[PDB]
Amino acid sequence: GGTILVVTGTGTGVGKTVVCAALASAARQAGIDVAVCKPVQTGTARGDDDLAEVGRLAGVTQLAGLARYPQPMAPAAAAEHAGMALPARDQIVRLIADLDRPGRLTLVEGAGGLLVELAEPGVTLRDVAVDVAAAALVVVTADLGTLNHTKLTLEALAAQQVSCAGLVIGSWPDPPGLVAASNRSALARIAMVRAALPAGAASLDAGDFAAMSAAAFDRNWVAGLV
Amino acid sequence: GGTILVVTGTGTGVGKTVVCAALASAARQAGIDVAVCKPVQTGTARGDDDLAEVGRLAGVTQLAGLARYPQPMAPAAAAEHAGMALPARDQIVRLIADLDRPGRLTLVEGAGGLLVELAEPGVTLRDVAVDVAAAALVVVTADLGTLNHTKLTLEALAAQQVSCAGLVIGSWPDPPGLVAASNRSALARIAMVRAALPAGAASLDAGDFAAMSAAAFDRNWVAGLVG
Ligand SMILES: O=C(O)Cc1ccc(C(=O)[C@@H]2CCC[C@H]2CC(=O)O)cc1
Ligand SMILES: O=C(O)Cc1ccc(C(=O)[C@@H]2CCC[C@H]2CC(=O)O)cc1
Numbered sequence: 001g002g003t004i005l006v007v008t009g010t011g012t013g014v015g016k017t018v019v020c021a022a023l024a025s026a027a028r029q030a031g032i033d034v035a036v037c038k039p040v041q042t043g044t045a046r047g048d049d050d051l052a053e054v055g056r057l058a059g060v061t062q063l064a065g066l067a068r069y070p071q072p073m074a075p076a077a078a079a080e081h082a083g084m085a086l087p088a089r090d091q092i093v094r095l096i097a098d099l100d101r102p103g104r105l106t107l108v109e110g111a112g113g114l115l116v117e118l119a120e121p122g123v124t125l126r127d128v129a130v131d132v133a134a135a136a137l138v139v140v141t142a143d144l145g146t147l148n149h150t151k152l153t154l155e156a157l158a159a160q161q162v163s164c165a166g167l168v169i170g171s172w173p174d175p176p177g178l179v180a181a182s183n184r185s186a187l188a189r190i191a192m193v194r195a196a197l198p199a200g201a202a203s204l205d206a207g208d209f210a211a212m213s214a215a216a217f218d219r220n221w222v223a224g225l226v
Numbered sequence: 227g228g229t230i231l232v233v234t235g236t237g238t239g240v241g242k243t244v245v246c247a248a249l250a251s252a253a254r255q256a257g258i259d260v261a262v263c264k265p266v267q268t269g270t271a272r273g274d275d276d277l278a279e280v281g282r283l284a285g286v287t288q289l290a291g292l293a294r295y296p297q298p299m300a301p302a303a304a305a306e307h308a309g310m311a312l313p314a315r316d317q318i319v320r321l322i323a324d325l326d327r328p329g330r331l332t333l334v335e336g337a338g339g340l341l342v343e344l345a346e347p348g349v350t351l352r353d354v355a356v357d358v359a360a361a362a363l364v365v366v367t368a369d370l371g372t373l374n375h376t377k378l379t380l381e382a383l384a385a386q387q388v389s390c391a392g393l394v395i396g397s398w399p400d401p402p403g404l405v406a407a408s409n410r411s412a413l414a415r416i417a418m419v420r421a422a423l424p425a426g427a428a429s430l431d432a433g434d435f436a437a438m439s440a441a442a443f444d445r446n447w448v449a450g451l452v453g
Contacts (some may be wrong), residue, residue: 011371074373077408113374115381145237147300148339152378155341159381182303 004134010149015170017050021057025213035062043072135165142180166192227326230360236375241396247283251439261288269298361391395422
């Protein structure tokens with residue numbers, strides 16, 4: 001196989017997708033083949049489609065998904081309101097593992113955060129990450145509260161021996177501001193900060209987003225990913 | 227001693243103070259002597275003073291602070307930015323043990339979320355709860371994000387055998403939308419939900435707030451907090 005990263009966030013709206021896109025883009029630009037798997041998508045009622053954002057921003061075509069729920073809520077809650085179970089632990093793991101292939105970076109995007117139920121029964125992105133032996137790249141914010149949320153997340157990760165491939169700040173504010181500037185220093189004392197995506201990065205066109213992405217991550221880290 | 231409860235949250239701005247005040251108020255009305263403790267207060271240059279708020283809302287006069295930093299930031303950053311050091315682990319613990327007393331509910335309101343550093347090095351409210359043998363009451367929101375945040379907090383508490391006293395939804399909308407309602411249902415499956423304070427509970431005057439506080443909590447749970 002190749003390298004499987006699960007991409008998780010410290011919450012929702014923290015920039016998970018724009019981060020998958022950005023690393024997919026950067027790794028594509030290093031001649032790495034990228035697949036992005038979003039097993040469970042929610043909020044399709046209002047048009048959430050993270051795989052499509054990825055395809056648009058990053059030109060990834062191996063965009064793989066299992067289920068889509070309309071309600072913009074947690075996967076189990078959306079599934080509840082819709083009357084249909086979540087996927088199985090088995091389809092998630094096998095879907096990801098079949099994606100995996102040597103020379104390919106396979107990015108697995110969760111829904112919300114690390115412990116929200118993704119499959120039946122009660123199985124989380126952390127379990128998935130375990131099952132496929134993937135590290136977790138953690139998307140974090142720059143705002144007040146990120147340090148707790150990040151400490152909590154890395155703790156949860158360590159608890160099941162899921163390695164941490166670092167943090168990405170989903171949205172770097174401009175101007176940074178006292179808190180954000182502080183948090184970036186503080187966050188790097190906890191884990192490697194692979195990039196800080198500028199605020200507004202999700203609105204860029206493909207060509208701009210590609211430039212952004214290549215400039216966002218350390219080139220060697222990216223190339224050293226597979 | 228009596229009963230010590232650290233009050234944490236899944237984050238910041240989730241309603242730790244209002245809950246502190248609300249549980250204080252419900253406890254006082256049950257005839258329980260309440261002290262509220264805020265070992266680390268940041269944002270004092272903003273006017274942030276949670277003890278003052280808890281005093282204002284619940285009429286608690288047994289308020290006990292230790293460290294105050296002016297900038298509204300994490301204690302560590304607030305401390306560093308002001309040229310100050312964080313308290314030591316035992317300074318916080320000493321403040322709490324000095325309030326602890328039989329028949330008293332001592333509430334220790336954290337700063338931000340459970341794993342915020344309160345004292346050098348990396349000492350958190352979780353560690354403080356081990357030191358004073360306090361259970362933790364987790365203040366959560368009803369909003370998108372919360373089930374992951376609550377599970378992270380509870381897992382983090384269980385990692386140090388810090389028992390969970392339950393959850394309080396710090397702001398509960400009326401009416402509740404699909405998300406809020408579904409979040410409440412799932413929250414109650416994770417732990418006991420001891421109250422859901424109505425949104426804008428902080429704008430209630432003293433006797434409105436005390437009325438809200440008495441209804442918000444199960445009298446039996448409150449009464450059983452202190453012997
Ligand atoms: O942990 C919790 O209870 C909260 C929670 C968990 C997952 C999600 C979602 O999947 C969101 C639904 C609308 C956008 C989408 C964004 C995303 O996937 O992060 C939202 C909230
Ligand atoms: O980012 C992290 O996790 C660390 C962090 C630590 C403390 C705080 C605070 O204390 C807030 C700062 C201004 C109000 C105040 C409200 C509160 O007491 O939580 C916020 C974040």
